[PDB]
Amino acid sequence: KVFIGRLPIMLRSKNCYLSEATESDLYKLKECPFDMGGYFI
Amino acid sequence: MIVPVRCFSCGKVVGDKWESYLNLLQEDELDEGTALSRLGLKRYCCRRMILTHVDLIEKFLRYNP
Amino acid sequence: EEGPQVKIREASKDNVDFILSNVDLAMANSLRRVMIAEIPTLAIDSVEVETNTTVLADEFIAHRLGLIPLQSMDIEQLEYSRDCFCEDHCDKCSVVLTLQAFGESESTTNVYSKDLVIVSNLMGRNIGHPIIQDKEGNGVLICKLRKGQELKLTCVAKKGIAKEHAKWGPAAAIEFEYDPWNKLKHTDYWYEQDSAKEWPQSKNCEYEDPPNEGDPFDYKAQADTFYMNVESVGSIPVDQVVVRGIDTLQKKVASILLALTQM
Amino acid sequence: ATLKYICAECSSKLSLSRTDAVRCKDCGHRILLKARTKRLVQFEAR
Numbered sequence A: 001k002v003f004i005g006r007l008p009i010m011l012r013s014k015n016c017y018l019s020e021a022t023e024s025d026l027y028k029l030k031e032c033p034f035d036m037g038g039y040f041i
Numbered sequence B: 001m002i003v004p005v006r007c008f009s010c011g012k013v014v015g016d017k018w019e020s021y022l023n024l025l026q027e028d029e030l031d032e033g034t035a036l037s038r039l040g041l042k043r044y045c046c047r048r049m050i051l052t053h054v055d056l057i058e059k060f061l062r063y064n065p
Numbered sequence C: 001e002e003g004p005q006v007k008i009r010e011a012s013k014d015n016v017d018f019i020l021s022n023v024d025l026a027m028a029n030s031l032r033r034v035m036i037a038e039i040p041t042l043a044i045d046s047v048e049v050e051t052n053t054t055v056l057a058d059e060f061i062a063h064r065l066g067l068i069p070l071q072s073m074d075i076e077q078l079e080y081s082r083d084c085f086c087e088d089h090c091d092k093c094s095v096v097l098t099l100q101a102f103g104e105s106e107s108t109t110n111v112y113s114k115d116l117v118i119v120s121n122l123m124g125r126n127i128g129h130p131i132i133q134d135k136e137g138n139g140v141l142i143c144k145l146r147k148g149q150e151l152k153l154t155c156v157a158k159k160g161i162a163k164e165h166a167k168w169g170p171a172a173a174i175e176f177e178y179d180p181w182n183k184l185k186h187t188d189y190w191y192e193q194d195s196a197k198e199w200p201q202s203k204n205c206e207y208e209d210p211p212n213e214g215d216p217f218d219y220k221a222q223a224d225t226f227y228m229n230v231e232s233v234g235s236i237p238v239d240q241v242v243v244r245g246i247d248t249l250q251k252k253v254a255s256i257l258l259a260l261t262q263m
Numbered sequence D: 001a002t003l004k005y006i007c008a009e010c011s012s013k014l015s016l017s018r019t020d021a022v023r024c025k026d027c028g029h030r031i032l033l034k035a036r037t038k039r040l041v042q043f044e045a046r
């Protein structure tokens, strides 16, 4: 398969966990459900 | 965060009427204005106090840590 | 009984709508100010926080606690902590209360002022009791807890005045009006087309005689007869606020004659 | 008795020194919180 490089992910993009998180899942993850998420960490 | 204990302007105790205001809305299906008036809040300074509050603690309580 | 003249219109456990008459505006106004800022009262002025897992900060909760109306009926039988000959505080000058709450149930646990517990000896005087007026006996909602959150405090009430902090104020609002009919002409009405038509007529206009067209300006008429209405916050009976106000002002005026004496 | 450190998620009280790594028990999280002191804090209710 081969691993090459690393790509930082934009919050709430398809590839981000939060994208599918419900209002509840988000709370557990200590993430505000009001966070819009169009940035990187 | 939560219902301020007193009204900023006059000090009239208002932090003991949040739950009542809420019931007067859901259970009694009264309108905001008619509700605040039944809570003894006549001067616009006290009225705004409750009518404008934002009970953010509810969402805060929703965290685990 | 000659001099000032009271003439109550309404009265209840919360308000005293009356009509001061035969007095100088200054006195009327002075009393109005004293009721607002110099009537002794008891109020949380120290909070020891042992456990706090609540969503609120200590000072946030502390702040609110001090705002909780406390029974101040026999406030005169409680020395000012700054005068008391003890070290810090004691039953002679302070009332100690505790607040212990745990998030037991799954539903949000509400921590009201009723949950406050006096731990000092009241010595039989009506003082320190958290005031309650809601039809549920809960009182003021201090905080809220989620299952698992805890809050263990220790409040130390103290006698104080509004001048030092609004929390110590027994009054709420104080309606004050005189000359509902602008006969004295103390104010110049703003208007577009009609002074009278545009400006709402006062409640007290009924309790007085409307000026007569022809009569020239009565340049001698002074400002007497003031329509007030006091509203208690609960720490003290409505009538008391007034009475004690009248008394406090009376003390100040006296503290001066005594100054001239030892001068 | 005592509770020097606390875990971020499982909230399980931990307590270790150096060479003890920087994890917690069961939960491999590497956060940990200082835990409030015992010395009671006083406040001006103003």
Ligand SMILES: [Zn+2]
Pocket: B007, B008, B009, B010, B011, B012, B043, B044, B045, B046, B047
């Ligand atoms: Zn107000």
Ligand SMILES: [Zn+2]
Pocket: C081, C084, C085, C086, C087, C088, C089, C090, C091, C092, C093, C094
């Ligand atoms: Zn003392």
Ligand SMILES: [Zn+2]
Pocket: D007, D008, D009, D010, D011, D012, D024, D025, D026, D027, D028, D029
């Ligand atoms: Zn852990």
